[PDB]
Design an enzyme around this catalytic site. Structure first.
Site, PDB file in Angstrom:
ATOM      1  N   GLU A  11      -2.434   2.893   3.862  1.00  8.67           N
ATOM      2  CA  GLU A  11      -2.418   1.928   2.766  1.00  8.67           C
ATOM      3  C   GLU A  11      -1.481   0.745   2.970  1.00  8.67           C
ATOM      4  O   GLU A  11      -1.669  -0.298   2.339  1.00  8.67           O
ATOM      5  CB  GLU A  11      -2.085   2.621   1.446  1.00  8.67           C
ATOM      6  CG  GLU A  11      -3.100   3.669   1.021  1.00  8.67           C
ATOM      7  CD  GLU A  11      -4.442   3.100   0.603  1.00  8.67           C
ATOM      8  OE1 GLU A  11      -4.589   1.864   0.459  1.00  8.67           O
ATOM      9  OE2 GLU A  11      -5.368   3.905   0.404  1.00  8.67           O
ATOM     10  N   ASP A  20      -7.325  -5.366  -2.386  1.00 13.96           N
ATOM     11  CA  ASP A  20      -7.631  -4.273  -1.467  1.00 13.96           C
ATOM     12  C   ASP A  20      -8.906  -4.559  -0.659  1.00 13.96           C
ATOM     13  O   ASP A  20      -9.475  -5.660  -0.732  1.00 13.96           O
ATOM     14  CB  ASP A  20      -7.671  -2.907  -2.198  1.00 13.96           C
ATOM     15  CG  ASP A  20      -8.909  -2.715  -3.086  1.00 13.96           C
ATOM     16  OD1 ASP A  20      -9.835  -3.542  -3.062  1.00 13.96           O
ATOM     17  OD2 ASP A  20      -8.954  -1.702  -3.830  1.00 13.96           O
TER      18      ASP A  20
HETATM   19 NA    NA Z   1      -4.175  -1.063   1.012  1.00 21.57          NA
END
Ligand code: NA
Length: 164
Positions: A11, A20
């Site tokens: 992440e 994202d």
């Molecule tokens: Na991310």
């Protein structure tokens, strides 16, 4: 290696609101804020999550706090889900991390739809499960991350996260 280190690799860490892989406003270590295209809506969600009026910016400690909550929520979610819990319970701890990773990325409902993959995992048919897991929007959209998670399910080792 453990689930925290694994998800930190997958992440990243960003202290300002960003979009994202799906274009959704996010902050910290993959903390999804909202699917709304409104930055103002995302900022509101951030303030609610942190408990103060941010400038769209958080500290590392705050990011790690949200991350802890999110990992805990993913686990709790798996355990409350009638389809996911038995498969999760059947796994060793390394493969349990791969399971948490999936739920963190796509949510409980999304993962619970991987019915055939889940069955193969519970059967411990690891190569077959790995092939099936890759036949997915998940794999097509985030192939490098999905490959790492799938390798973790295939092998029950951390080999895909070593050198990272
Ligand atoms: Na991310």
């Amino acid at each position: 290696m453990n689930i925290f280190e694994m998800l930190r690799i997958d992440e990243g860490l960003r202290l300002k609101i960003y979009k994202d892989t799906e274009g959704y406003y996010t902050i910290g270590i993959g903390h999804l804020l909202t699917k709304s295209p409104s930055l103002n809506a995302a900022k509101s969600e951030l303030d609610k999550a942190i408990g103060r009026n941010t400038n769209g910016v958080i500290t590392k400690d705050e990011a790690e706090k949200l991350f802890n909550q999110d990992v805990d929520a993913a686990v709790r979610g798996i355990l409350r889900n009638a389809k996911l819990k038995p498969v999760y319970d059947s796994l060793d701890a390394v493969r349990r991390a791969a399971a948490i990773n999936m739920v963190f990325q796509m949510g409980e409902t999304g993962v619970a739809g991987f019915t055939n993959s889940l069955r193969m995992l519970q059967q411990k048919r690891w190569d077959e499960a790995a092939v099936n897991l890759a036949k997915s929007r998940w794999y097509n959209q985030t192939p490098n991350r999905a490959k790492r998670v799938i390798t973790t399910f295939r092998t029950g080792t951390w080999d895909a996260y070593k050198n990272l």
